[PDB]
Point group: C3
Chain length 32, copies 3
C-alpha cells in the first residue's frame, strides 16, 4: 500500500544520494 510506496521512495532517494557521493569522490580525485 501507501506505506510500502513511501518506503520505495526512501530507497530511491538513498540510491540517488549514493550516486551523488560517487560523483563527489571523482571530483575530489580530479582535484588532489
Amino acid at each position: 500500500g501507501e506505506i510500502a510506496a513511501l518506503k520505495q521512495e526512501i530507497a530511491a532517494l538513498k540510491k540517488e544520494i549514493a550516486a551523488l557521493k560517487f560523483e563527489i569522490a571523482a571530483l575530489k580525485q580530479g582535484y588532489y
Copy 2:
C-alpha cells in the same frame, strides 16, 4: 497530518537532489 508532512519532506529532498545533480554536472565540465 504526519503522513502529509512526510510526503512534503520527500518532495523537498527530491528538489535538493535535483539542484545537487545540476551543480555536479556543471562542475564536472567547468560550466558556470
Copy 3:
C-alpha cells in the same frame, strides 16, 4: 510504528544532503 521509522529515515537523508551541499560548495571554491 512505520511513520516514526520513515521520519527517522528522512532525518538521516536531510543530514546526508547537508553534507553533500557543503562538499559541493567547497569543490566549487577549489576549482574556481
